[PDB]
Design a protein around this nucleic acid. Sequence first.
RNA 1: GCCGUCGCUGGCAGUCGGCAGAGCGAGAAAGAGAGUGGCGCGGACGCUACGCCGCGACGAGUAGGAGGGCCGCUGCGGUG
RNA 2: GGGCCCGGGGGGCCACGCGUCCCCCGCGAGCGCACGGGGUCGGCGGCGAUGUCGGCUACCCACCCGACCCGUCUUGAAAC
Lengths: 4, 128, 233, 44, 63, 225, 124
Amino acid sequence: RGLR
Amino acid sequence: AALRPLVKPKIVKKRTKKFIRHQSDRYVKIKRNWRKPRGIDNRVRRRFKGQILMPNIGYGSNKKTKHMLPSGFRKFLVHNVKELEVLLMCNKSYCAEIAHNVSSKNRKAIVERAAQLAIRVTNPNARL
Amino acid sequence: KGKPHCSRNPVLVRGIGRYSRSAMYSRKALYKRKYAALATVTKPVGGGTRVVKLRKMPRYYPTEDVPRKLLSHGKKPFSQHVRKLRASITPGTILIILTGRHRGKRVVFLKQLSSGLLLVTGPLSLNRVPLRRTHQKFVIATSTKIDISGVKIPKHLTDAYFKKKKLRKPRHQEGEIFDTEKEKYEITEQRKVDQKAVDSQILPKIKAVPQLQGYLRSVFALTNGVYPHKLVF
Amino acid sequence: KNLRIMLKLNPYAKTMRRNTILRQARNHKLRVERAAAALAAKSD
Amino acid sequence: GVDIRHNKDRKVRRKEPKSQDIYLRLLVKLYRFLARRTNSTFNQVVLKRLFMSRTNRPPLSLS
Amino acid sequence: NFAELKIKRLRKKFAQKMLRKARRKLIYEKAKHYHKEYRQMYRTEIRMARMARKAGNFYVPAEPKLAFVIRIRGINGVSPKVRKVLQLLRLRQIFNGTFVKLNKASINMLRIVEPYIAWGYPNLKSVNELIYKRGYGKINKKRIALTDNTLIARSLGKYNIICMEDLIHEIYTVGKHFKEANNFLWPFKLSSPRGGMKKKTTHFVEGGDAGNREDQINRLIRRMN
Amino acid sequence: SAHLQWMVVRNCSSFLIKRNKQTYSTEPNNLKARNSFRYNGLIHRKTVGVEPAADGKGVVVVMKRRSGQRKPATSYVRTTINKNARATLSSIRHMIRKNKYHPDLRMAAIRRASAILRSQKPVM
RNA sequence: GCCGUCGCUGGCAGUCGGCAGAGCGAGAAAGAGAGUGGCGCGGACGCUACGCCGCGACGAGUAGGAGGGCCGCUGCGGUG
RNA sequence: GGGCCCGGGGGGCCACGCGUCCCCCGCGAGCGCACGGGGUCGGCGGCGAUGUCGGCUACCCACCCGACCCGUCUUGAAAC
Ligand SMILES: [Mg+2]
Ligand SMILES: [Mg+2]
Ligand SMILES: [Mg+2]
Ligand SMILES: [Mg+2]
Ligand SMILES: [Mg+2]
Ligand SMILES: [Mg+2]
Ligand SMILES: [Mg+2]
Ligand SMILES: [Mg+2]
Ligand SMILES: [Mg+2]
Ligand SMILES: [Mg+2]
Ligand SMILES: [Mg+2]
Ligand SMILES: [Mg+2]
Ligand SMILES: [Mg+2]
């Protein structure tokens, strides 16, 4: 989820 | 117009000469067929240096190219016309070799069929 | 529709970049680049329309087929191979042929073609070696160079320009009737004009060096007491 | 002898090797700096 | 050369039944399939017992 | 439907793509911490000798824990007591090599088989060259070449040895699971000594080859591996 | 059953032929002619055969109907396909696939029905 | 590199195809489970399972033992 | 030196999200390149019909190294  | 095989790999043979029998040269009663020498003081079965050699299993041929003639085809003895249709779905990997006894009247109508079936014959000019 | 950009890190050594993974991330500014989320054809006929099928099924199936083969990665075609060249060979360097019909003949190296073959031409009026290709392995690079930087070698002297052309004259019915042997290689007026043009620029520079033309006219050959490993050429 | 098998087994050797190449080009640049500051110490 | 001893290299277990009947050589096919394709060590024992000689699988009594 | 089963299978194919990035990151920061370990264990062995030379005393370094044993004789004419020990050292073949941790019960075997082996204290570079180039694992009782970390993790994983670097660290720094790590390694098969032995039949102190050549085992490893 | 009478026919048949390290079979409806459980043309409940047409041209296809199983006379059905080289290789293909009739034999049937077309052209 | 023996008491009946969905090499005991509420009609080979395929290790030998011989000789019942 | 080189005031990091509670103070798509699960060329050139191309084996000959005559009893046989 970190790269959204 | 040669009938090429499916694939023609490189054939490598670990030995070409025959395996002559010990002392098959000094005598005529001793044929060239091989017999493993089993005598006590024998110099061949002790594997001395510079002597005759022995058929080990190491000399075996590559299974991929074993029994394979120099034309890239394996072989099959054919005794009559009917034994070709057995060979018509192995066309590009096996060949036919009409037997020695099939007379020339039948061998002509065998090479005739194998020509239509594109089966390769090793002795197609045999008898005539 | 982003314009392509070259690599942002120079290659320190083959397979290793100059910058690290984090350095590359910072350089690329990826911190602000977060992203998240045929065969048939109708054709009229003289009736109705026919759904013509492209690449229809084959009409023959051979009794046996060779199975496919595994996939390699490190093998590339010769056209895509990388062409090496020893540092001892530079434009204007004098080379000696050892295998061609011009055995032991000194020639003036011009450049290297795309394929890899060395495009060389000794003065035709001196050694009779025109513009031709020669493999670098089979040529000895003499340690005698002449400034050839100011020589506009025509661009059309590619590998295709120098590729052989089959005479294609085995026989025919016309030829069997009026036979003319198997033909020859008739030097094209192009290969001749190009040879003359290249010589017109190479010869003035060669003649500047004293005795250089005579040396080129000479032929290298081993003599008694001469060993290649003991003399520097 | 195979860079990417060494990275298949030890992904650290990539930075271990980028170092000691940078570190070496900079130690050879420091040496050529000393040795080209001393050719002006026996010329001055 | 290596200094091993090949005295016991050839394990002597039965790779297959010695009989040639075809109502046993079909059971051994079905159970050789179950034996290799399941993780139940039951089929492996049934298969290993279908090989055994007539003196190693003896009769049972009803009692 | 199958629009559900597709995106589901792609979630599985994404969890199996993140469980690999997390493991490559773990292997990376492990090797990065073993570089630090080896640098410390190297610099402090020089500290502990400079601080003794400043005061005038002597620093006796710790007797080494790890030995590398090489078989330098054939199989033709061995005593039975030396043939049982050359096979509990797994040296069943000339030029075979193995790692051995030292204690009383081990040195007293390397004393029994002394005329048949040439053992010593391996460097860290020698364990690198060995584990990488001649490193084979005894998987399923099969000498399987160690080509990927998933061959070491699959067997020695339960000991938190999951890469060729954890393996090297377990061998070099003799660890709790040394018996298991050293026994996972199929004994190394080394070539003939390039250059050549000095004299195979006499101890190393007799200007020969046999016996213990403590520091100098690495000179032989480089010309044999 | 098939596997039962195959365990009887695998070695002591009369069509079995064993020489030159090869082992073919001369069964009527065996295509590829080789001795195997899969291609045997007498053991199974549904077989396929591709013979040449009795005259010069054409290829006959011999399916074995299901109902008549112990009645050799009314067991096989035969269909002569005297068409071009491609429609016959799309008819055998449909005969087998669209019918779902012994479907592992299809490429064998095409490969044989092509050997026949090839062995019926004018020679060179 | 090739032949062979041994071991893995290894793998393959999954050729599961418009009644289709093409996978089980991956470090971590176990379901690519169910339901219950918030156009173009197409897809190599295989499998004599006593068969085929993959991996490693191994390979001396008299006396002696065992196996495999699509090695050979003569006749018999079948079958080509 | 070690402590993530404890804490305060020019180069390399497999570090780079927002919203808190809190002690320490689960799918982003593409596009290529390759030291990446064992070789390919989408590189070429020469000669070839009455004298030449190929044939390892098989016939004769030459030369270099090796090379004592087999069976047998025997601790031991090329054995005077
Ligand atoms: Mg004797
Ligand atoms: Mg004796
Ligand atoms: Mg051996
Ligand atoms: Mg033995
Ligand atoms: Mg035994
Ligand atoms: Mg000795
Ligand atoms: Mg040397
Ligand atoms: Mg001695
Ligand atoms: Mg033996
Ligand atoms: Mg001599
Ligand atoms: Mg006697
Ligand atoms: Mg006596
Ligand atoms: Mg005497």
